[PDB]
Swiss-Prot record:
<feature type="disulfide bond">
    <location>
        <begin position="17"/>
        <end position="28"/>
    </location>
</feature>
<keyword id="KW-1015">Disulfide bond</keyword>
<comment type="subunit">
    <text>Homodimer.</text>
</comment>
<comment type="function">
    <text>Mating ciliate pheromones (or gamones) are diffusible extracellular communication signals that distinguish different intraspecific classes of cells commonly referred to as 'mating types'. They prepare the latter for conjugation by changing their cell surface properties.</text>
</comment>
<protein>
    <recommendedName>
        <fullName>Mating pheromone Er-2/Er-9</fullName>
    </recommendedName>
</protein>
<keyword id="KW-0964">Secreted</keyword>
<dbReference type="GO" id="GO:0000772">
    <property type="term" value="F:mating pheromone activity"/>
</dbReference>
<dbReference type="GO" id="GO:0005576">
    <property type="term" value="C:extracellular region"/>
</dbReference>
<keyword id="KW-0588">Pheromone</keyword>
<feature type="disulfide bond">
    <location>
        <begin position="12"/>
        <end position="37"/>
    </location>
</feature>
<keyword id="KW-0732">Signal</keyword>
<feature type="disulfide bond">
    <location>
        <begin position="5"/>
        <end position="20"/>
    </location>
</feature>
């Protein structure tokens, strides 16, 4: 399991949302795919 569900979010890599599932999938999505993903 390289990287965690967090790490998928933390990386901004919606593609690797696979670590997260269900609510956490769509949550990691909603962060990673956010236009302002770590955008100041």
């Amino acid at each position: 399991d390289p990287m965690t569900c967090e790490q998928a979010m933390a990386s901004c890599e919606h593609t690797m949302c696979g670590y997260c599932q269900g609510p956490l999938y769509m949550t990691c999505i909603g962060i990673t795919t956010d236009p302002e993903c770590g955008l100041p």
